[PDB]
Amino acid sequence: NTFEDFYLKRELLMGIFEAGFEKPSPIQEEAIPVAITGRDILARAKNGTGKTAAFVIPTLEKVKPKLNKIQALIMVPTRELALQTSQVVRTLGKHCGISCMVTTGGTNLRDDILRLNETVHILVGTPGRVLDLASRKVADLSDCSLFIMDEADKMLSRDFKTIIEQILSFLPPTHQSLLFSATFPLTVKEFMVKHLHKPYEINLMEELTLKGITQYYAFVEERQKLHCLNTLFSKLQINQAIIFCNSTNRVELLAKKITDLGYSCYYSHARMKQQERNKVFHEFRQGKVRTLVCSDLLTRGIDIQAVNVVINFDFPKTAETYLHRIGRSGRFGHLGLAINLINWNDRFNLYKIEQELGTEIAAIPATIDKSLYVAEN
């Protein structure tokens, strides 16, 4: 339940806890052990899920302060992401005795060259600039056995992909590569096959499945939504449930209302600090409460096994969002229930999402068969 579990350097744990980090995000929890193993990683990651610390923590663990060489290279497409990355490195690694340098475009090349006169353990930078410094022989990447790409798709388009390959020529032939990307077009997939060794893959499916999820809709007006939900919860045999709303404020308001009715729940939304969201994920997965009200998931689709009922309190506008809410990546035998609260204004999107996803969302029956969503799990 804590970063202490990962058996990390005392000094690294100090920086983690002093930075207000406590419980890892799903991507951090999965990626950290894998990176410590020495595996290559290819990970679909979205923003606001703590992907930066997922690679920075293993980097700080592996890097040896006593060796006066660049041991990790973190590639990023923009200066803004370089600065966000170095902030995490210097915060989490406050007590580690490790030195980080940023090198990007839109800065004085001269100042980066003289900085390299002094010790750099972790180099964070953009393709053009990093290649520039490597080719001039100012940045010595001969011991740089850890290679990281953050937003790999942006740096693996046709006008950047050759630059990345040229940078890899300066690394030791044997290196670990951790790549994180939101999308996986042809050029990205080609690079991965060529330049990763049997990578551990996180969330790479591409299209979530609705198989085993029986989907219904209850026609309601806005004022009925709470009472419809209340009625359903009194009748359904819920293990755990997740309820989606379309705004962070509606998340909070609904959570308050059901709490007042006496339902055990947490809420989680995108305006919360990352670390507060991680806390909810862990305690909800532990089964400390029955219900999670949220605006979205930290994970890609629900992967809490005990959730057998999912409610769209507000119906989404697009098929993409519907699928991300109701679809899943693994456990293909799983059976669950999804109920959509549909007002008059959702009528078009209802038909549109059914069509685009090639799925059925039938009118909710008076009684729902338990075989559709209750197992001996």
From Swiss-Prot:
Coiled coil: none annotated. Signal peptide: none annotated. Its main location: cytoplasm. Changing residue 151 to A: Leads to mRNA turnover defect and no growth at 37 degrees Celsius. GO terms for molecular function: ATP binding; ATP hydrolysis activity; chromatin binding; mRNA binding; RNA helicase activity. Residues 32-202 form the Helicase ATP-binding domain. The Q motif is unique to and characteristic of the DEAD box family of RNA helicases and controls ATP binding and hydrolysis. This is ATP-dependent RNA helicase DHH1. It comes from Saccharomyces cerevisiae (strain ATCC 204508 / S288c). The chain holds residues 46 to 422 of 506 of the full protein.
